[PDB]
Specification:
Chain B: Belongs to the SEC61-beta family. Chain B: It is found in: Endoplasmic reticulum membrane. Chain B: It comes from Canis lupus familiaris (Dog). Chain B: This is Protein transport protein Sec61 subunit beta. The structure is cut from a larger assembly and holds chains A, B, C and D. Chain A is an all-alpha fold. Chain A is built from four helices and no strands. In chain A, helix 1 packs antiparallel against helix 3 and helix 3 packs antiparallel against helix 4. Chain B is mainly α. Chain B is about 70% helix and about 0% strand. Chain B contains one helix and no strands. The longest helix of chain B is centred in the middle third of the chain and has 21 residues. The N and C termini of chain B lie far apart (about 40 Å). Chain C is mainly α. By secondary structure, chain D is mostly helical. In chain D, about 50% of the residues lie in helices and about 0% in strands. In chain D, the strands form two sheets. Chain D has a three-stranded antiparallel sheet with strand order 1-5-4, with no helix packed on it. In chain D, helix 7 packs across helix 18, helix 11 runs parallel beside helix 13 and helix 12 runs antiparallel to helix 13. The radius of gyration of chain D is 29 Å and the shape is globular. The chains are: A mainly alpha, B mainly alpha, C mainly alpha, D mainly alpha. Chains A and D meet through helix 1, helix 2, helix 3 and helix 4 of A and helix 15, helix 16, helix 17, helix 18 and helix 19 of D. The complex binds a molecule of 8 linked components (NAG-NAG-BMA-MAN-MAN-MAN-MAN-MAN) and ligand 9UB. Ligand 9UB binds next to helix 3, helix 11 and helix 17 of chain D.
C-alpha cells in the first residue's frame, strides 16, 4: 500500500538525521568561548570536522531533504493531471512547489558551503 | 486588501526587525 | 602530460555536454512515436 | 555543412547514434575522473591497503597459479603465518593476473593494479545501463549511467590508485542484478544459469554476498506477502540459489559456512518455504477447496512445523579506525548532492507502477539505506542504489514534462533540471579533488606559498629496511602498518591488520607497555631484530601509535598485571589526561613517552609537539634495552636497533 511509502519516507530523514548519532549523541549548539566579550553564544551547525553533527544539525538536514522529495511527489500527483480547478488551485500548486524546489536546493547549497568552506 | 502591500508592509516590518536585530549585533560578538 | 586543473575543466565540460545531450535524447525519445 | 542531422531515421537508428554516443562519452567520464588523484601526485598506490593485495597479485602471475597452486607463507605473521585460508577473494587477483596474462602477452605490472579501478568504473557504468534498461526504459538509464559514472563517493573509495578487496565487488554485485532481474522478468533458465555463473564472480571477491543472500531470498519472502508469485519467479530463483550454493561451496572463506551461519541458514529456510509454497499452489488447484484439503493441510502443516522445531533446536582497533564509525549527511549530501533529492522520486514511481521487477529495487533501496546508517565504509552499497532510483526519478520528471509542449510550467520545469542537475557535475568534479586526492604513504605538508614543503619519509625508511638490514629479521611496530612493511622491504613480520587471531595482537600491547624490563622480555620471547614506531608530533595531523594509544591502553587479554586495569597511569589522578610535567609519572616510565622521545628536548624549541602542544624538558634519553637505527630526516620514524 501507499502507507508503506509513507513508512519509508518517514524512515528516510529519520536515518538520514540521527540514528548514527543516537549512541554518539552530541548536544545541540553551544561552542563559543567569549569570542571577545560575550561568553557562551550557541554557534551553528558543526563546520570544522565533517563527519560530526549535533541533534539540531541533523534534524534540519533531514527536514530539508524530505520536503524536496515530497515536492516532487506533489508535482507528479496533482500538477500533471488536469482535473481540478484549472486556474486557481493548480497555479498555487506549481507556485509553492517551485518555491520549495528552488529555495530548498539553494539553502541546502548554503548549508553545505558555510559548514564546509567549499569553493563555490 | 484591495492591494497586497499591507502584507508586503508586514514583511518589511519583519525585515526591519530581522536586519536591525543583527545590525547592532554586527559591532558586537 | 596534462595537469590537474586542465583535467578539472575537462571533466566539467564533459559532464555538461553529457547531461545536456541526455536531455536531447530524452526529447527525441519522448517525441517520435513507437 | 551536411545539414541532414536531425532528419535521420531517429527513434530507430539515430536513436542508436545518440545512444552509443552517450555510452561512449559517459563511460569516458568515470575512468577519466578517477585519474587526477594519481595525476596530481602519485604513480602507483594511495592507501596502505592495496600493498598486501599487490604482493600476492604479482605473486599469482609470477609463480603461483590458482587451479594448480594455492599458496603458503611464513614471511607474514611470525611465528604463526596466514594463508589463502584467509583473504577471502581472489576475484581481484585473478582479474588482474588475467589482464596481464592477456595484455602482457600483448605487452606494465605497475599499470595493472593502478589503472584497474578506472576500468572497473567504466565497465560498471555500462552494466548499469543494461540494468536500467530493464526497469523503466532505455531512456531511463541514459541519465542513470552518468550517475554512477560520477557519484563521487563511489569514485572516492575506488580511485585511480585503489585496489581494495571490495574494489570490484561492486561491479559483480551490480552485474548480478542484471543477472537477476530479467531472469525474474523472464524465466529463461539458460540465461539464469548464466546468472548464477556470474554470481560466482561476486561470491569470490568480497563478503557482501552474506548481504546478498540476506537480500535475494528475503526479497522473495516479500513476494509471499504481496502474493505476486509465478513460475517465472520460481524457475529462475531455484537455479541461482541452489547452484550458487555449490559455487560458494567451492570457495574456502565461505566453506562449509553455506551449511552453517545464521544469515544464509535462514535464507535456506526461506528457499524451502518458497519451494513449498510453489508446490502448494500447484496442488489443490486441481482439487476443489474441499474440507479435506483443510484436513491434509493440517497434516502437512504439522510436518512443516516439526521441521521448524527440529531446525530451531539444531543451530550450529577496527571500530576506532575512523571510518567504520557511523556517518551523517556529509558522507551523505556532501557525498551525493543532487542525487539525494531525486531518490524518493523514482521510488514513488516505483511505488506508483509497482511492477514485479521493481519491488526488488525498492527492497534494495530500503536495506542499503538501513545499512549505510552505521558504517560510512558501507556507503558504497548505497553508492549505486540512489543512482538507480534517481535515474528513474529524473527520467520520470523529464519524461512527463517534455511530454506536454512541443508535440509555461514546462518552460520552467525542463529548464530548471539542467542547472538543477548539472551543478552535480560541478560538485563531482571537484570534491574528488579536495578530500580524496591524497595518498596514505605521502603526506602533503604546509609552510610556504611558493615551492612549499610537501614531502617521503615512508619510502625513505622502508627503503632503508630494504638496503641496510639482514635478510631474516623482525618487523614489529603496530598492525595497521603491517602490509606496507611487506610492500618494498621483503621483511618478516609478526602482526598485520586482520584480525583473525586477536590474542597474538594483544601481547603487542605488552610489547608497547609500561615496564621496559617486562616488555623487552616479551620482545626477547618473540625473536627481535628491529622495532618501529611513527611520530606525528611536530606537524600534528599525521597519525601513528600514540593516538590509537588509548586503544592500546584498554586492549586487554592474556594479562593480569598492568594491562588488567585500563587506567594504568595515564590520567591526572582525578581522571583527566595529561602527559607532560603535569602528566603522570608511570607514563614517564612507560615506553611510548620514551620509546618515541629521544633527544627531543635538544632539538625543537618554544614548547611544542603540536599533537599535545607538549614541552621540552624531560631528560628522556634512556635506551635501556635498544639503540637507535635511524636518525630521522623529518622526525618521521625512529628505527630501533634492538640491543641485547
Ligand atoms: C593465536 O595466537 C596466540 C598467541 O600467539 C596463540 O596462543 C598460544 O597457543 C599456544 C598453543 O596452545 C599456547 O601454548 C600452550 O599453553 C598451555 C597453557 O598452559 C597454562 O597453564 C599451565 C598450568 O595449567 C602452565 O603450565 C602453562 O605454562 C606456564 O609454565 C611455563 C613453564 O613454567 C611458563 O613458560 C609459562 O609462561 C606459564 O607460566 C600455562 O600457564 C600449556 O599448557 C601448553 O603446554 C603444553 O604444550 C607444549 C607444546 O604445545 C609443551 O611444550 C608443554 O610441555 C605442554 O605439553 C603438554 O601437552 C602436549 C600436547 O599438547 C604433550 O605432548 C606434552 O607431553 C604435555 O602433556 C602433558 O600435559 C597434558 C595436559 O596439558 C596431559 O594430557 C599429558 O598426558 C601430559 O601430562 C602450551 O604451552 C600458548 O599458551 C598460547 N598463548 C596465549 C598468550 O594464548 C594461539 O594458539 C593462536 N591461535 C591459533 C588458532 O593458532
Ligand atoms: C585484504 C583483506 O584484508 N581482506 C579481508 C578478507 O580476506 C577477510 O575475509 C575479511 C574478514 O576478515 O576482511 C577483509 C576484507 P573486508 O574488510 O572488505 O570484509 P568484511 O569485514 O567482511 O566487510 C563486511 C562488509 C560487507 C558488505 C558484509 C556484510 C556486512 C554486514 C553488516 C551484514 C549485512 C546483512 C545483510 C542481510 C545484507 C543486507 C543488509 C541489510 C539487510 C541491512
Amino acid at each position: 500500500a501507499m502507507t508503506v511509502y509513507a513508512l519509508v519516507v518517514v524512515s528516510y530523514f529519520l536515518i538520514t538525521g540521527g540514528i548514527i548519532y543516537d549512541v554518539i549523541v552530541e548536544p545541540p549548539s553551544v561552542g563559543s568561548m567569549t569570542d571577545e566579550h560575550g561568553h557562551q553564544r550557541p554557534v551553528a551547525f558543526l563546520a570544522y570536522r565533517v563527519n560530526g553533527q549535533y541533534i539540531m544539525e541533523g534534524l534540519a538536514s533531514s527536514f530539508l531533504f524530505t520536503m524536496g522529495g515530497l515536492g516532487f511527489i506533489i508535482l507528479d500527483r496533482s500538477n500533471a493531471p488536469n482535473i481540478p480547478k484549472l486556474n486557481r488551485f493548480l497555479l498555487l500548486f506549481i507556485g509553492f512547489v517551485c518555491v520549495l524546489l528552488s529555495f530548498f536546493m539553494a539553502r541546502v547549497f548554503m548549508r553545505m558551503k558555510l559548514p564546509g568552506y567549499l569553493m563555490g | 486588501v484591495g492591494p497586497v502591500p499591507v502584507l508586503v508592509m508586514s514583511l518589511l516590518f519583519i525585515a526591519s526587525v530581522f536586519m536591525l536585530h543583527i545590525w547592532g549585533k554586527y559591532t558586537r560578538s | 602530460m596534462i595537469t590537474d586543473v586542465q583535467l578539472a575543466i575537462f571533466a566539467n565540460m564533459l559532464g555538461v555536454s553529457l547531461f545536456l545531450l541526455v536531455v536531447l535524447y530524452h526529447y527525441v525519445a519522448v517525441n517520435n512515436p513507437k | 555543412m551536411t545539414k541532414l542531422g536531425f532528419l535521420r531515421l531517429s527513434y530507430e537508428k539515430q536513436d542508436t547514434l545518440l545512444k552509443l554516443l552517450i555510452l561512449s562519452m559517459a563511460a569516458v567520464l568515470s575512468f577519466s575522473t578517477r585519474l587526477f588523484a594519481v595525476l596530481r601526485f602519485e604513480s602507483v598506490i594511495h592507501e596502505f591497503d592495496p600493498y598486501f593485495n599487490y604482493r600476492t597479485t604479482r605473486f599469482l602471475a609470477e609463480e603461483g597459479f590458482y587451479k594448480f597452486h594455492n599458496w603458503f607463507d611464513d614471511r607474514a605473521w611470525y611465528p604463526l603465518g596466514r594463508i589463502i585460508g584467509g583473504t577471502l577473494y581472489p576475484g581481484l587477483m585473478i582479474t588482474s593476473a588475467a589482464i596481464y596474462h592477456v595484455l602482457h602477452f600483448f605487452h606494465d605490472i605497475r599499470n595493472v593494479c593502478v589503472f584497474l579501478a578506472p576500468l572497473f568504473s567504466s565497465f560498471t557504468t555500462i552494466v548499469t545501463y543494461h540494468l536500467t534498461k530493464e526497469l523503466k526504459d532505455a531512456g531511463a538509464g541514459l541519465l542513470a549511467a552518468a550517475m554512477i559514472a560520477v557519484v563521487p563517493g563511489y569514485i572516492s573509495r575506488s580511485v585511480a590508485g585503489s585496489y581494495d578487496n571490495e574494489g570490484i565487488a561492486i561491479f559483480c554485485m551490480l552485474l548480478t542484478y542484471y543477472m537477476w532481474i530479467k531472469a525474474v522478468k523472464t524465466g529463461s533458465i539458460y540465461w539464469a544459469a548464466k546468472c548464477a555463473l556470474a554470481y560466482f564472480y561476486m561470491v569470490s571477491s568480497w563478503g557482501g554476498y552474506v548481504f546478498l543472500i540476506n537480500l535475494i531470498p528475503l526479497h522473495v519472502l516479500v513476494l509471499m506477502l504481496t502474493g505476486r508469485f509465478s513460475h517465472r519467479i520460481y524457475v529462475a530463483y531455484c537455479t541461482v540459489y541452489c547452484l550458487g550454493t555449490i559455487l560458494s561451496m567451492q570457495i574456502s572463506f565461505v566453506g562449509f559456512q553455506p551449511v552453517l551461519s545464521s544469515e544464509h541458514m535462514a535464507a535456506f529456510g526461506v528457499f524451502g518455504l518458497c519451494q513449498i509454497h510453489a508446490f502448494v499452489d500447484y496442488l489443490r488447484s486441481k482439487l476443489n477447496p474441499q474440507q479435506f484439503e483443510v484436513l491434509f493441510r493440517s497434516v502437512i502443516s504439522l510436518v512443516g512445523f516439526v521441521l521448524l522445531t527440529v531446525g530451531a533446536l539444531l543451530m550450529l582497533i577496527i571500530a576506532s579506525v575512523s571510518e567504520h564509525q557511523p556517518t551523517t549527511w556529509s558522507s551523505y549530501y556532501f557525498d551525493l548532492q543532487l542525487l539525494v533529492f531525486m531518490f524518493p522520486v523514482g521510488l514513488y514511481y516505483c511505488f506508483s507502477n509497482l511492477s514485479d521487477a521493481r519491488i526488488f529495487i525498492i527492497m534494495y533501496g530500503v536495506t542499503s539505506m538501513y545499512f549505510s546508517a552505521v558504517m560510512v565504509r558501507l556507503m558504497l552499497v548505497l553508492a549505486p542504489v540512489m543512482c538507480i532510483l534517481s535515474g528513474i526519478g529524473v527520467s520520470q520528471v523529464l519524461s512527463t514534462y517534455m511530454k506536454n509542449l512541443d508535440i509555461e510550467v514546462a518552460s520552467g520545469m525542463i529548464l530548471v533540471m539542467a542547472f538543477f542537475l548539472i551543478t552535480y557535475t560541478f560538485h563531482s568534479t571537484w570534491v574528488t579533488s579536495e578530500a580524496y586526492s591524497s595518498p596514505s604513504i605521502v603526506l602533503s605538508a604546509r609552510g610556504g606559498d611558493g615551492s612549499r614543503i610537501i614531502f617521503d619519509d615512508f619510502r625513505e625508511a622502508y627503503y632503508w629496511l630494504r638496503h641496510n638490514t639482514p635478510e631474516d629479521a623482525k618487523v614489529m611496530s603496530w598492525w595497521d602498518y603491517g602490509y606496507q612493511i611487506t610492500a618494498m622491504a621483503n621483511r618478516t613480520i609478526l602482526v598485520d591488520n586482520n584480525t583473525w587471531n586477536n590474542t597474538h595482537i594483544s601481547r603487542v600491547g605488552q610489547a608497547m607497555a609500561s615496564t621496559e624490563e617486562k616488555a623487552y622480555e616479551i620482545m626477547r620471547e618473540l625473536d627481535v631484530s628491529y622495532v618501529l614506531v611513527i611520530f606525528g608530533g611536530l606537524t600534528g595531523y599525521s597519525s601513528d601509535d600514540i593516538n590509537k594509544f588509548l586503544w592500546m591502553v584498554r586492549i586487554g587479554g592474556s594479562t593480569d598485571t598492568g594491562k588488567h586495569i585500563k587506567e594504568h597511569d595515564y590520567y591526572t589522578p582525578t581522571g583527566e589526561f595529561r602527559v607532560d610535567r603535569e602528566g603522570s609519572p608511570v607514563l614517564l616510565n612507560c615506553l611510548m613517552y620514551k620509546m618515541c622521545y629521544y633527544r627531543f628536548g635538544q632539538v625543537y624549541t618554544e614548547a611544542k609537539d603540536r599533537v599535545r602542544n607538549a614541552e621540552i624538558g624531560n631528560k628522556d634519553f634512556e635506551l635501556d634495552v635498544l639503540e637507535e637505527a635511524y636518525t630521522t630526516e623529518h622526525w618521521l620514524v625512529r628505527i630501533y636497533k634492538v640491543k641485547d
